[PDB]
From a paper:
Finally, L‐sorbosone is further converted into 2‐KLG by a NAD(P)+‐dependent L‐sorbosone dehydrogenase (SNDH). Sequence analysis showed that the SNDH of G. oxydans WSH‐004 belongs to the aldehyde dehydrogenase (ALDH) superfamily (ALDH‐SF). Like other members of ALDH‐SF, SNDH has three typical domains: bridging domain (Red), catalytic domain (Yellow), and cofactor binding domain (Green). The crystal structural analysis found that the SNDH could exist in two different catalytic loop conformations, i.e., the oxidizing SNDH (O‐SNDH) with a closed substrate pocket and the reducing SNDH (R‐SNDH) with an open substrate pocket.
To prove the hypothesis that the catalytic loop is dynamically regulated by a disulfide bond, the catalytic residue Cys296 was mutated into Ala. Mutant C296A was resolved in the form of a homotetramer, which can be described as a dimer of homodimers, and there was no obvious difference in the main chain structure between different subunits. As expected, compared with O‐SNDH, the catalytic loop of the mutant C296A shows a significant difference. Since Cys295 in the catalytic loop cannot form the disulfide bond without Cys296, the catalytic loop enters the enzyme, which makes the substrate pocket present an open conformation. The cofactor pocket is connected with the substrate pocket forming a cofactor‐substrate‐channel, in which the nicotinamide ring of NADP+ is located. In the cofactor pocket of C296A, Thr160, Lys186, and Gln224 stabilize the adenosine ribose. Lys186, Gly219, and the backbone amide groups of Glu189 interact with the 2'‐phosphate group. Trp162 and the backbone amide group of Ser240 hydrogen bonded to the pyrophosphate moiety. Leu263 and Glu294 stabilized the nicotinamide ribose by hydrogen bonding. In the mutant C296A, since Ala296 has no sulfhydryl groups, an enough space can be left for NADP+ to enter the substrate‐cofactor‐channel.
Numbering used by the authors:
A (entry chain B): 9 to 498
B (entry chain A): 8 to 498
C (entry chain C): 8 to 355, 357 to 489
D (entry chain D): 9 to 489
Write the structure that this text describes.
Amino acid sequence: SLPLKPREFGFFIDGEWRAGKDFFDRSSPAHDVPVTRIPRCTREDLDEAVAAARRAFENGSWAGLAAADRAAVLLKAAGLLRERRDDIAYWEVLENGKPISQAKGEIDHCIACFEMAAGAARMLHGDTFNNLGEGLFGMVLREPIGVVGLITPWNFPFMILCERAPFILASGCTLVVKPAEVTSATTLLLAEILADAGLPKGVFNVVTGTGRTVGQAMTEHQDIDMLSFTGSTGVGKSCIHAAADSNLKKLGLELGGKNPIVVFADSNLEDAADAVAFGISFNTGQCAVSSSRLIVERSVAEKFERLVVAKMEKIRVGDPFDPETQIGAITTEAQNKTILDYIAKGKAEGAKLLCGGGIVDFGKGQYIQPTLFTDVKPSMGIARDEIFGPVLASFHFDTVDEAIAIANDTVYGLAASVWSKDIDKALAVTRRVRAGRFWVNTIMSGGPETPLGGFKQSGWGREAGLYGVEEYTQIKSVHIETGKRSHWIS
Amino acid sequence: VSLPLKPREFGFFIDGEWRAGKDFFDRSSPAHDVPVTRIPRCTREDLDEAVAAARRAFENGSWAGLAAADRAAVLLKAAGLLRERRDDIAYWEVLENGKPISQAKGEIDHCIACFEMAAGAARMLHGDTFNNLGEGLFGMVLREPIGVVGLITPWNFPFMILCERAPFILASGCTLVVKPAEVTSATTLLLAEILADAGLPKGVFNVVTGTGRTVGQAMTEHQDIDMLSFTGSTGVGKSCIHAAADSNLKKLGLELGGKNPIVVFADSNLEDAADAVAFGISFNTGQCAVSSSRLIVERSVAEKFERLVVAKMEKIRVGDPFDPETQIGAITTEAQNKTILDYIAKGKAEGAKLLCGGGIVDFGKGQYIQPTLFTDVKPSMGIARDEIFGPVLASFHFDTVDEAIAIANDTVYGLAASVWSKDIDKALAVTRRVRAGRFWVNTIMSGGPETPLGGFKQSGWGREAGLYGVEEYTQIKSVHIETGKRSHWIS
Amino acid sequence: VSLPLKPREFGFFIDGEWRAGKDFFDRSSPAHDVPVTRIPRCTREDLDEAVAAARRAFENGSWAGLAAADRAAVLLKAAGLLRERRDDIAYWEVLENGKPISQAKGEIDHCIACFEMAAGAARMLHGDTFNNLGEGLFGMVLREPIGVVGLITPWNFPFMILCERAPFILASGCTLVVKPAEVTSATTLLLAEILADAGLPKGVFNVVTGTGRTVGQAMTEHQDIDMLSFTGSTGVGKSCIHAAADSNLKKLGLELGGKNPIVVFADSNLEDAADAVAFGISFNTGQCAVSSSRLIVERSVAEKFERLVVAKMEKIRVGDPFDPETQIGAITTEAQNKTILDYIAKGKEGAKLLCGGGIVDFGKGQYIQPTLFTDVKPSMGIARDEIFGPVLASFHFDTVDEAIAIANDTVYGLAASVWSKDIDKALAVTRRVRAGRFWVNTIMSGGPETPLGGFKQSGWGREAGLYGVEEYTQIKSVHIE
Amino acid sequence: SLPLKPREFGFFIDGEWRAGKDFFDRSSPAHDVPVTRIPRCTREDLDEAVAAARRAFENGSWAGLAAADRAAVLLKAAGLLRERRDDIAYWEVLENGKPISQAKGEIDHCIACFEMAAGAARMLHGDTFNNLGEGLFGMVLREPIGVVGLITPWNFPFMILCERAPFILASGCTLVVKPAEVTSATTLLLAEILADAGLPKGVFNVVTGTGRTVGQAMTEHQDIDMLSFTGSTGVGKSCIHAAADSNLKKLGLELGGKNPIVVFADSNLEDAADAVAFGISFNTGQCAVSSSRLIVERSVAEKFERLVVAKMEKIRVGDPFDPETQIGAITTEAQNKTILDYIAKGKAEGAKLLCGGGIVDFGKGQYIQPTLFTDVKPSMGIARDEIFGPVLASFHFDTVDEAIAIANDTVYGLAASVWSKDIDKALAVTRRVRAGRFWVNTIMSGGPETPLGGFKQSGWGREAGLYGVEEYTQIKSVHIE
Ligand SMILES: NC(=O)c1ccc[n+]([C@@H]2O[C@H](COP(=O)([O-])OP(=O)(O)OC[C@H]3O[C@@H](n4cnc5c(N)ncnc54)[C@H](OP(=O)(O)O)[C@@H]3O)[C@@H](O)[C@H]2O)c1
Ligand SMILES: NC(=O)c1ccc[n+]([C@@H]2O[C@H](COP(=O)([O-])OP(=O)(O)OC[C@H]3O[C@@H](n4cnc5c(N)ncnc54)[C@H](OP(=O)(O)O)[C@@H]3O)[C@@H](O)[C@H]2O)c1
């Protein structure tokens, strides 16, 4: 089942797998066994990857193709994703700790993303303005912005990769990808999948390594035209600084969240409780769209919190390779400590622990119980800070206005969920809560047809959908004068 | 004809209310060296108040909660008031900026078009429905005004750039805190008056006048401005980006510098191209971010064309901006005047050949600079790379389409580009392969607000005008609704 | 308000010129039975002349060749003149139609919105670029005005429907030949004046007044009308369709009949729904294609709700359309008045009369009481056929599926209304009822931002919104190299 | 390699192959050997297929799926198309006569069409109007129109099918397909491909038979919500009548054409000559987008015509299974006579034959030479009538205005091609010639990213592109208060 020896990966620039010299040793967060050895690349490796990406972009080998040919590769990548689902998921689990059932289901979304991007490759379009007059023809062109840096986090290593890479590639952009050091394997597998899919060399390059070395060099890179960053708001701001200090590269930022899940008394309380438990426990709460702030109508608040407790206590925690396991390991020790500290702060600051609050001790790996706090004052740390763990903070409200104000009482704005059978309540919360991803009587549903992204400090730009493909294009307005010019100078 | 007897002292505009300043910036006509205006130097507390007003006006639904029809009504009425007040706006525009009155008036037409475009866009602003997701899953994408928008504008097209931003920002339901250039604040304050007369609710458009280093920097750093429209130098654009990172991650619509190529092919109408080239670098005395500052001309006609451009530049009517025949006006600021003259000196010092201009035009008053053409420009010279923001054209020769494109693309910028060729393939190749956000084919600086404008690379972020410019100040909200019965995660 | 001492004689409008009639239709106020207007009865030669003017105005670039900015300027100025002339348009609208003056005035607001929307759409009208086809292949999709557009409008919303078509057609650069309903031509000629005063070039908007038999049929058959907007009966729509096949294959934007459901759930705000149901069937005295003709109400509240509708339907102010308090005006034509009364007679097939059932006799004009039938069986005439009067047929249901099946049980599909606070019920009904215009917990509330049109036999194409501007454009794909 | 006995097909209803009772016997138009036996279905068969498509549409088995699931099937079908390329092309060649190389290359476009439709299935979207005020939310939904009839011609049996069916299927529409009786094989093969790709039963039904039996019943059917018709303008008009006389079904019409190819002196004349020869000789001119009217600048007209003559005479005519063969057989005897007649009419009316003008005698099928007439006067039959054969009518011009006026001098408006290195000429012609599919310095080059269709009598609606998927959706405006 688990690797007898950690799998040594290379990094990938210009279609060539490159042996590492220095390596990050990744142990399974769920099993405390060595699983992979990932090259710790240098800035020079990054430069070569950017150079390869630049070459692959400037020589027309990808952007010069018909959308049909880019779609062909992406549709083939999607097919290979299906064929390799189990292998990708196995390595995804090994490095991330998420359940194998979840990882497999994520691959389905990844396949949908590739198909969507393939479709979007063809539908990527600008405008014609044939309405400007007899001698004035206007158009708006879209063209791939060029070399796109892609930095991804460890919580959904492959999925977030597939929620970016295909959409970026679809327009004809080329990619330099730095996955999270702890979860680089499946990104390298995608590099192989893409190569097997017929992606030209240099179009998808993976420079593995640390955020401080490779990532920072990417965000500062003078020849990366745009960077998709998914990760903390803190490092996102560093990306922004780096863009300003380098080449003004565009940034597609997918940052933190402290997402509200607003539950009204007139919701299906059982459904909402399941969704709330799911919303904060999915990926063991290592989820930027996790519903970490329960905002429940006071009349059902205390019952509903308990409904969530019942739901959370039935969540199957265990070996992620158990197909029955529903939430897996905390991916990193730092995040594990962060979550535990936040639970400690929650207790210390006077919040009432309703369930969870501690580790799950399997003697191996790092697991944390789904945790629900109530009696949370908006000023508590667990109320404001992204815990990135299965830690739910519950807030009560009497009115729709209070619900949306609590929901909006955040620096973030990634996601929000509203549970109500009342169309007006649903639409009011949906329309007035500043979140880029909204779920009404659902959570974390919807495929790559729709753009995703955040308001406020949750990021810049949108990903997936046609939007996500357009996000990595530049808009070029073109005005053609066809009549004789009336001269400015006599 | 007649300058103000005493400089007109303006207020600033917060929450529908004109405010007396405490400290004032004294602005003299750059064309006349006469005091013309007196502008409040606002404080950060003023800025905070304006943001608070913009926030209030945004959150209380007085603007964003209206129907688009009501926002369109105000924008359309404002468009009407722009037409009615054209001469007055243009008068103050000329006074603070130095551009010719005829250009200033014609700029107002574009302003009217922008307000109409935005008024129309207000209604057409839309997201998506995904009715194709299955019986039990309904998806939509909403657009909504991002909220409080900071708007920082430069002095070169004070009113026009303002009107190329504010109505599109407003159209979605955003509220605005505006800092115009310190030296050209009047007409932005006039727009506040116009907008109020057009029925714009209080707090929706606020003007906090003052310096970019005080009010502007505080705007870019403001914890409660959700987005900042910045038009100005790439250098200050970078300050905005840092400031966004250091504050609230506000979105930035950046309209930055340019070093825009005008690619002239031998098979173009060379006389038309020469006129457009002369215009492209001389319009607004070259204080124009979309100015065609880099002539990229096919070597076979390069010398003929450069001479054609010189002949065109020599006839550009320089003079008193209130002369309706004046075609280029004063340099707006002394710093920019010195910068332009320095770049002309640097051009000569670096070995470029001056073909015409190269110096001031001395009227004994104000600051005028001759339309200036350099040839023998090497790509590494300062005038080849730095934006001079004056009427200084650098000429480069090419033999091949690829060379023209490589020269045209040889810049950190990517705001604008012009290609002159009757050959559809050359025109399309240059158009598609030169990294500029605004392309003109056999034209220059044409096309109204129907289309988005913006830059590639260091020329900015985002697009302005068109429906795009309205969408740029909206947030995209995906909404998935599950109907039917939830399949429970937990058993 | 004074009615005209002598009927106002109009001209028809060709190539920017007012044209004296030879023969005239004499129109009396349907509300006052006094002559109000005299309208030219034009010929095929007048029609051909207008089409030739519209052709000329289209081919010479005087309108389509302009920048969208200049078309927008005219439409915006037209919108301004509409506001200035609201009272005058509304007066003639009331005189020839019988709708209340208050309603006529509010319709003018929507007309202004339409002109503004059309002005905005003129600039935003766009196709696509396909810059993604490879370095050696560039693709575009151009939109261009289809050319000369015939516009046939009905008498129920003569000015409003005109403004819900004409500016959207004009926005793209199309030229128009308009035949309004013979009985309600005045305000269409007034728009011709408004458009001329707004700077519309000559020949871009031509009004050939007259009968559908002469002018309309000639429009639908015309070898040089590139597209025809028809708003009117499904029957005449089919005649337009036949005429298109038999002539030049002109495109048809058809806005046809309807038998629209208003689905009311017990969990709706029942008082609001009752008001909306009363409004939806009584607005314009039910002479409304988007009228909620079939109340589909949850059995658990059905007769209680029917009572609320009865109570509100009996409180609707019927009277002189010039009374600003009047909420329903006259039936516009005798034929329609007979039809509605006949349908009330047929209904009385055993349907239970709950309110109305008869005319309102103020002594003059033609008024019909807001009428509610219950115990309506799906096979009855009043259940299925469009009455085009203030005649509501009530049906009961227990399940969402039933409501949707009842709602969909029509050859039509113009409009639908669902009343429920339940989001699942609202979306299920909204998504599964085949109607082009849907209202959730509202009725007749959307402005011209959105396209309007029908499913099934309620029409072809959409009007209003940018879609409606696009409907009168041709799509031209362009591939280069 | 030729079939020993004609392949007897069934027709395809509700996922089941159905043995025919009456049969159309199809012989290879290129080889005059029996090739297929195709059910001549009845109107009852068609009713059954419609019922299945109605069933498959209403039970949510296709329209109720996520777009992802329809895309999955479409993408899988695209995969099966690639696997079955040779088999599809083989039967396509047998029944149509086109060269195997072209038939195989057409399948590439078919795959692109399925891929594009799969993509569009996911992107198919309407609008949200979140800008209508705090108390009014507006939406525009798109939804599959329902049961779509699909009637296709014999000139591109598989390609046109794949240029319609997947785009129609993409939205969730179900299909009843009648291919050309003479070329039904590969359409039945698509039904199988779609079944193997997991398409639910009843979503794609093929009722083979005649247009006058099966086709007319489709166009007249009371339960077909929209019909995609590709074929003659005459029959397109019959569909229009049938729609008016039945259920007001929407019509996507892809009708005739008389397409201009405007060649300027400043074009690459050899490139244009090759494109001109191809544009009229592709599919042996049995192509609605064929450039049948050469409109060439007088200054190079005769020089260019000679280049075209030289190009046409090198066009490899022969056995379509020869991979080197460039143009194949005339597909039907009626069309062969028609082409030959028009060549006769061309000579009889005084046009100067420069090349071709007769059959190519292989002792076997029906082949016609690429044919070029010059001195063609606008009143001649070959100038105006669609020949649907490899017969080029050449016209000369001096001015851009002339080229455009000649190009527009047709009742049709399907396609046009302009050849010029001059961007102004290219854009002027492109913008002013009323054709729905335009080629600049190319011919027949766009993939399915773009909509295709005609102006004027060349059809209604657009196909391919997201637009073509949208054409088979209904627009439903929704306003929520
Ligand atoms: N869709 C979303 O919005 C989304 C989804 C997932 C995660 N997140 C957010 O990410 C956070 C948790 O993930 P995390 O702890 O992995 O975040 P993180 O510390 O920001 O790491 C994200 C990625 O950025 C890299 N990185 C680190 N420093 C960098 C620098 N200076 N320049 C460039 N790249 C740099 C990291 O490399 P290393 O491998 O060396 O750390 C990693 O690959 C939460 O705030 C969560 O909400 C966002
Ligand atoms: N559409 C365009 O892309 C466009 C158009 C015009 C100008 N530009 C660019 O602008 C440059 C020349 O114009 P300029 O001299 O006015 O540019 P600038 O120095 O960047 O000034 C632009 C505006 O930014 C303000 N500002 C200055 N420092 C700031 C700071 N730290 N934070 C926030 N705002 C600050 C200025 O205030 P002060 O009034 O105190 O200077 C002024 O209102 C050229 O590079 C040109 O290409 C761009």
